[PDB]
């Protein structure tokens, strides 16, 4: 296992290509029919920042939940006493790129529970091994992970 380099994306293609997580299908708002296709994640071994205090960060697609749950396990295994942490899941704050996969629940921004930025390269490596369809060392403060639609 080698940590991803700063700004490295795996696989080596645009996020929204067929080879990656594939195309933006559209924004999901709290009204929408599609809102109901979002599972809240209550895995007790995942820290959700939820600074919004709405629980938005827990909402994601089935596929996102699955990869996130797998990564939760490999993070506890990688560092004794550390957990996966989510800063963003589904988003209604418009805090992303114009057509973020966050706006339809197909992306998470992640850290370790200790916010040790030296761990974050290895964290991205784990998110690839967990089966995220696109991993990106997006900033010094987070790894962005996304998934194909259902």
């Amino acid at each position: 296992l080698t940590p991803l380099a700063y700004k490295q994306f795996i696989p080596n293609v645009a996020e929204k290509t067929l080879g990656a997580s594939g195309r933006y299908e559209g924004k999901i708002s709290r009204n929408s029919e599609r809102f109901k296709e979002l599972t809240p994640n209550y895995n007790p071994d995942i820290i959700f920042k939820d600074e919004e205090n709405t629980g938005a960060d827990r909402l994601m697609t089935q596929r996102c939940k699955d990869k996130l749950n797998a990564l939760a396990i490999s993070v506890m295994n990688q560092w004794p006493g550390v957990k996966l942490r989510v800063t963003e899941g589904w988003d209604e704050d418009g805090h992303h790129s114009e057509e973020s996969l966050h706006y339809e629940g197909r992306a998470v921004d992640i850290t370790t529970s200790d916010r040790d930025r030296s761990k974050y390269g290895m964290l991205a490596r784990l998110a690839v091994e967990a089966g995220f369809d696109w991993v990106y060392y997006e900033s010094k403060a987070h790894i962005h992970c996304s998934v194909k639609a259902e």
Partner: antibody
Framework: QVQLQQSGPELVRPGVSVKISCKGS????????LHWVKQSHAESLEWIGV????????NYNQKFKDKATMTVDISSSTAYLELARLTSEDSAIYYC????????????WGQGTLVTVSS | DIVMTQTPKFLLVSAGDKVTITCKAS??????LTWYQQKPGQSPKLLIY???NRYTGVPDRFTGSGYGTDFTFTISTVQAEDLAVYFC?????????FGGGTKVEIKR
């Protein structure tokens, strides 16, 4: 509504220290890092450093290593900047600013504290 | 430390016209480039991050581009209320560093 409320303006002699403050409201204080930014005519904007309230970890611009101390009081949701051994180059507006854990850049700024170093 | 050179230093521009500001870094800062707007008497306001993303509620007229050393900030159709000093800031290297700023003044 997130707000950073800074302490009032300060006149200090060269050689004296001054401690200014920045109180965070409308969010959970330990959720975000706090930064200090100096605005002078001489040097325009310069990053002094960052404190992480959650860990009390600090990182200083080496230019300010000897000049600046950052601390927080988690209880009052207040960050402090202490500037020691001041000269007229320290006269400036000092801001605090918050990141949103997406990189070291800042969506919320205090109104700024004008420090005049003068005899 | 990374030096950000911002040009021009001043622009005078009529409502409806284009503003183009350049920031060049002394070495590559990937896309870790932020643009702020400081209106007279105020604190800086963040408009653009990761070189090209608009912060929430920032209008369409504001755009950024670039990767590496060479970055561009545009106001497609400057309005009266856009008078301000614009600054870039890199956070690729430690410490973060800012450009010396561009003052935009309205010709009427």
């Amino acid at each position: 509504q997130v707000q950073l409320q800074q302490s009032g303006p300060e006149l200090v002699r060269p050689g004296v220290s001054v401690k200014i403050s920045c109180k965070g409201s409308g969010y959970t204080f330990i959720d975000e890092a706090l930064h200090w930014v100096k605005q002078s005519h001489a040097e325009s904007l310069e990053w002094i450093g960052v404190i992480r309230p959650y860990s009390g970890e600090t990182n200083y611009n080496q230019k300010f290593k000897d000049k600046a101390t950052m601390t927080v009081d988690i209880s009052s949701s207040t960050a402090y900047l202490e500037l020691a051994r001041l000269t007229s180059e320290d006269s400036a507006i000092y801001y605090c600013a918050r990141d949103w854990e997406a990189g070291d850049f800042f969506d919320y700024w205090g109104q700024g504290t004008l420090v005049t170093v003068s005899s | 430390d990374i030096v950000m050179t911002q040009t021009p230093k001043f622009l005078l521009v009529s409502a409806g016209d284009k503003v183009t500001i350049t920031c060049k870094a002394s070495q590559s800062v990937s896309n870790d480039l932020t643009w702020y707007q400081q209106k007279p008497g105020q604190s800086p306001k963040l408009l653009i991050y990761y070189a090209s993303n608009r912060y929430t509620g920032v209008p369409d007229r504001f755009t950024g581009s670039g990767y590496g050393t060479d970055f561009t900030f545009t106001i497609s159709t400057v309005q009266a209320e856009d008078l301000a000093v614009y600054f870039c800031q890199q956070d690729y290297g430690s410490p973060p560093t800012f450009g010396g700023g561009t003052k935009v003044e309205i010709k009427r």
